[model samples]
Target: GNRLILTQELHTMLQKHLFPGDGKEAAAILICNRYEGGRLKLLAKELILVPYEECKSRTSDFIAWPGNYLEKAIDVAEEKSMSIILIHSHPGGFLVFSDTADSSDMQTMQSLFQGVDAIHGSAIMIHSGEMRARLYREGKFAENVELVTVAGDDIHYWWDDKKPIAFTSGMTDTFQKLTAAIIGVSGTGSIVAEQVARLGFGEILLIDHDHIEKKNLNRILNSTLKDALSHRPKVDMFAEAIRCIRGEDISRPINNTIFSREAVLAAANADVLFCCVDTYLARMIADRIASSFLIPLLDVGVKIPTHVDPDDGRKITDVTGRIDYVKPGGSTLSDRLVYTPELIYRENLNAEEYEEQLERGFITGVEEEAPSVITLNMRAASACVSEFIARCFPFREYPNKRFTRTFFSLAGVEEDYIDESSITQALNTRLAVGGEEPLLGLPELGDK
Candidate 1:
């Protein structure tokens, strides 16, 4: 579970320093925060690019750094309690490490970081922009990095086992390059996050402002009584569970409502967004973020509608759940009239006001806690995750067979898909892919 995470900016920086249009080798020092457990989280924080002109010995096949360069990098790492990753390039775009690469730098780096008490490593980037990395632990042992994650508009995952090991081989790297945001950590959300992590997603951004409550213990995966008692943030609980899978800090938890500016910014940075929230406002915000950032959105919801007979308050309806995959510039949740104006207006009203309004016959539908069971959530969660997998991996017989939305009804144990195009016509203006300036055309996100 060794992971080296680099932001898109950092990856570009590495490329620039390594190639620079010259055939000779180049080097850089990667400064990162190291989290140690069953797995290692090497969070790249900064890069110190070494100019080739400064090296005493340099060539397309070999390079040598000045003694003082290593010292400076070690000092920086020591001062910040960070780890060091020595990076260089193979000018000819050779993806694999060479004997010279192993002999010239491995032991030297191990010895240099001997007293650091952190994971120190070396990485080689080919001219093609692919990377190979290994870690030096206890200044002696060397372990190949299991995954290299580049987080950007499209997240990238690089695995050490580059050969086609199985059918999933081609797809693993694709998923690693994508960022996914989970906007809730309740029943379906927690399960979705769990599956995403297990699938080795490169970077996962989790957004949930609520803390664990007793009622959440039933369906929220990995929630313990202790978490409920201590009122742990749902995002943190789910993140910890993800870490347990690989002991890496791949899950970025935000203990903030999706309506907050912070959550919006986080959502904007993701490649896709998942809406697991129960509130209309939350869904609306997620939809806006997805459209604004030109990111795909997968929304999941479960409802158990029950009509109470005035005589005895008996149940009258069955359970239902829906999963929708919304693409930017394509159909939208609001475009489908999923969140009608009335629903948004009702959510905007305060609880007391809403109750009073309903009593006065100002509103027809009352928002109540619907019946939910873990089993039902499992079925829905599985479908939602499967939809995502199909979209990315495309294991389906025909790509056109993909469904934009799926519906499930427990009453008859039936399931269906919306095979046709959805209601929203493609947006045809600058607002379609709301870029930097307007921040999705929302004034609130505009720069002050």
Candidate 2:
């Protein structure tokens, strides 16, 4: 089944422009780009808001807008061969398509197909902003849009083809229909992959460029000494582990860095993404993939900082654990200070040069190095998966939006959560902008 994906910005704009509070029907057009990720998805790119006065007749249940608006949308999408979704509003809050709308689309969509060779769709939005859509292919009615999502401060999912859900039970069956991508197959990433693999995710994607080493065995869940000695790729090892535990045909291993075009493309196909990479560059790139594809990203990090007190020569610890849920239009990892300019800059520096930088007293602090802690990784990784499930299934005591960022410290024996309003989020111009020329708008990531 085909799905429609829209960013919060676009959804809000459509909501505002389509319903002017007059209890009258209004019309608009959504220019969409075709993306074949996990499913055939239509990513809404631009909106063409029809003026209220332009409609020939606007009634409570009917709307007739001039064909010129459709003409403008086709011209805008002609260069990209994009899909068009003609959307209108039902101020009465009726979610289902009306008989008048069905007849209207049968007449209007025939010419729309003539204007564009690609598949087009029609959508109806009720006053509450719930959208129901169906596709038109080969000048005839096609499949219904099974899923409609708006990735905003919080993830919003509307299932058009299913019965009402309880938001409590039957999660495993739902998990069987979706895919999850783990961006790193190292310490925390390995635990994350293991948990999601056993939890019945329909498909699991494991990506990592590095090979197994002895140091990773203590923390990585499925890593073995034999496999480390053999220098097997991390993703390959984990993929086999998952298959042995679950079954074949559920795991896809990508033995490459997340920066690669292939990894980004594969991750985009996931219904959810987990970032457990230890580097700022990887986190930055994961942020890019999440924002561009509208995939909800749950990033986990565990740090056990060891600093020697200059006064008494005593070792101090700050065993910190962090879990962040970054919705498409919400605060990002960078926005949440997950990676900083100083942190990323130091990451790219050579080892010798970094020591020299330490002597020069640049960004001075405790050693500020990554420590080996399987226990910490297990805790953080478990929390991250729980966060993903709670967001999708909603069993939390409070709203999921209130816990966008969760931080805890075993050293202090305390934890804190940052709500959606507590953090500052920058506007992401790339939100829901998929299938672009230079993928994710990065020339380096573009196809050769």
Candidate 3:
């Protein structure tokens, strides 16, 4: 918290933008603001938040990156032509910067804190429930940053009010706004939509061209038996249900197939995309759109018992879900899982899909909507939503890279059982480096 008075809008945006999930990792850029008589005013606009999706040094257990993450923060600042502050979370502990964090901060001081004398210039730090910061000028420290909690929900602001007088515009200004697209609004997708709306995202685009069918009743959270009988589109049903359940301004839902051109365009415009779908074809298409746009994509899926075994017909397995966080140009859809190699052979693998993606071109994949089950779909949706929330809210820790489960397999224990490492290892790689490629996104190496 500094001299700038943060508004409610600024606080909500921070929660939605910086701490969207409980994942132990998060990163964002902070633009400088001019405070005139204790009122906050934006200095530079057009700045963007660059989540540390890249940075190879980060550990899988937590999104721990090399000190260079500060450099990325600086780039966001320079690109927007504004002073920048970086935000990170230590959700696991009581918001204390660890030895590792201290090391990084000192490193940043040596590199970026070389000039400028304005009290308005500084880097901000938010840990657990505590907030502390320092100012930089002429390669030296200014003054110990005084922590000031402004009036708002679970948000902190910095102030330089020596002699306080009713602060008129004590509000945080927004830097950028984005319209995100969420595909497949049933199980995990619906839950994700609900959470995003509640958290106050600026814009949301929900797409799902399917209707509520009796077959979906076993797992789909928003679908009712009546809905299935009435043949209602799942997206509409979810939109209405969420509208009634949450009392906040929400984005409209587009009841359309996930692979349509409209959906791809929406993906291109999105700041972030959540592919909470079940079909392989839809997943591939969503992956392509995300990769082309170089946007952040959270792809989620659930695998379950396809069919009961003939010999001992019993549904032994219950649930499984996977949450994959892919950054723009970070990893291709195929590189993340076994889903890509098969995708390479698809007839529409064009240059736009590879060399350049910004030119409105897309690569098409075979439409393969393979087998799926209800229970697992529900489980996957639930975890996917949790992951999304963790991405927005900084209250707790959550998985950053990938998460997967292979339930007891539902048939014979050994017959359907799979080790969790197989799927996770596959998720870690973006493109096949030097090999014959994998099948079904299977991992080429042993579990790390």
Candidate 4:
């Protein structure tokens, strides 16, 4: 599709950038911009500032201001032969998009831009962190307003930072609308948190009973040795970092593991859930939550192969990570992924020794690694993140596949494989039991 052209009046609105005050003021403009070859050139026009008193606070996540006026504003634009610039404000924070913003607030706003001559509407903010107005279209970024104001004074808006770039589309919808609860906050889990945070997901409901540790310095983002010393839980620390960096109060962390009833409810409440821990028991609980909630749960992991010398049995040439995107009716991790259920039995419990092997830690044998500099956990983590984004924004419709594997070899192989059926099925009956809901909480928010 070609880019839609904006009228001159709309261009002015795009340029004006920030909302003058509280978002309560209703502002409309018949602006214009050029759209040639799917690109936009925006301009600004008069902004109607609706006083704060006329605005109503729907919730921390939901924002609505004299929305009824939008109709009249559009009518006026059409009548005057101009385009409309629907404006709002975010006072305290910079216009940097956050994850929670993507799931709820942005989701609803995108809906408004469709279904009519709702020519592309842009936004600007007079944020406090740094002054700037941002030009954001529905679920996408058009350009930057360049200048933002803190208090009736001009401050520079900075977009050069690479961190906020990921939210370009992900944060547009579901602003504080969708809930995401993550379990575990170490290794790749830290990377997962960082990825989602910058992606602009709204309302991150994170869970992790563990605190920062020296072992975590290798991979998790934004944690300090100080946090570890103070016994600060990694989940809470990560959440605070996100809030501080983006200045959005959306990441909610529960300082507890996922076995409690509260953890179950939070997991059930997630629109999308990411299971980041490396324990079989944790995975079991995640599986159940996904099944019960019908939410899509993404289980990603990294498993280093045993150290094998060149002449060893099979040459242990590969270290791999598995990213399982489980839908409600699709294969369950327990039934199709994990094998050897009998391993869970313990001998002390009469005939339980057989089942002890089923215990995730026991069977998986995270044991210990030499902690080499050449490990690919980060690579695996990156692959997992890529898999997730692909699943969410596929360019075309296709059948849903169960799991994908990415292998990195210090020896040779390098491409990626998207197995239509889960590898668990391909490997063995090792792990293939149980059924539950899919991770569709936020995935269901849009028709796309």
TM-score of candidate 1 relative to the true fold: 0.61
Tens digits of per-residue lDDT, candidate 2, 293-387, equal 77789999888877678887646478889999998777888788888888889888888888888899875633654466888889999999988
lDDT of each: 0.73, 0.82, 0.49, 0.50
Which residue runs of candidate 4 sit more than 4 Å off their true CA positions?
1-171, 174-176, 308-317, 343-368, 372-375, 396-411, 415-418, 421-448
The digit string of per-residue lDDT tens for model 4 on 327-404 reads 543456776545234433332233354356556455443344444222465666666655555554432244334234
- The candidate that achieves the highest lDDT relative to the unseen native structure: 2
Per-residue alpha-carbon lDDT of candidate 1 for residues 228-287, written as tens digits (9 for 90 to 100): 999999999888888888688888999998877778876766666888988888887788
Q: Candidate 2: global Cα-lDDT? A: 0.82
Sort every candidate by TM-score, greatest first: 2, 1, 4, 3
**Candidate 3 C-alpha lDDT tens digits along 240-358:** 77677655445667777765554555555555688877566777767665543334567776554334668976544434455665543344456555365455344334655544542
TM-score of each: 0.61, 0.88, 0.45, 0.50
Please give the range of 10 consecutive residues that has the lowest summed lDDT in model 3: 167-176
Question: Candidate 1 at residue 19, lDDT?
Answer: 87
- Taking every candidate in turn, the Cα RMSD to the unseen true structure, in Å, is 11.6, 3.9, 15.5, 17.8
Ranking by lDDT: 2, 1, 4, 3
